[PDB]
Amino acid sequence: KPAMVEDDKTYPRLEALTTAYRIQQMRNNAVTTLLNRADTLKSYLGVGVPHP
């Protein structure tokens, strides 16, 4: 922000920052983690093979 003027258009409220934070933590990173876990299991164990 230019820090001698207050704004509501060049600056949406803190709610926008919180929304970006929540979406980033909850959706994209979690989905990436789940898919990477799936690919890791695929790579390590093969298919249909139960290890002791």
Partner: protein, 51 residues
């Protein structure tokens, strides 16, 4: 007869704009004060005599 043959074409332009630095970023004219000290001394002069 006077205008016979004249051709007129536009070439270019120049644009006048200021940069509205709301955050301020600019040099400018400084203003300060200075003092000159000067002194003036008084001598003596040759004397008149009565005898």
């Amino acid at each position: 007869a006077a205008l016979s043959g004249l051709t007129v074409t536009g070439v270019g332009y120049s644009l006048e704009a200021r940069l509205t630095n709301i955050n301020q970023l600019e040099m400018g004219l400084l203003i300060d004060s200075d003092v000159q000290k000067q002194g003036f001394m008084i001598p003596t002069l040759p004397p008149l005599v009565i005898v």
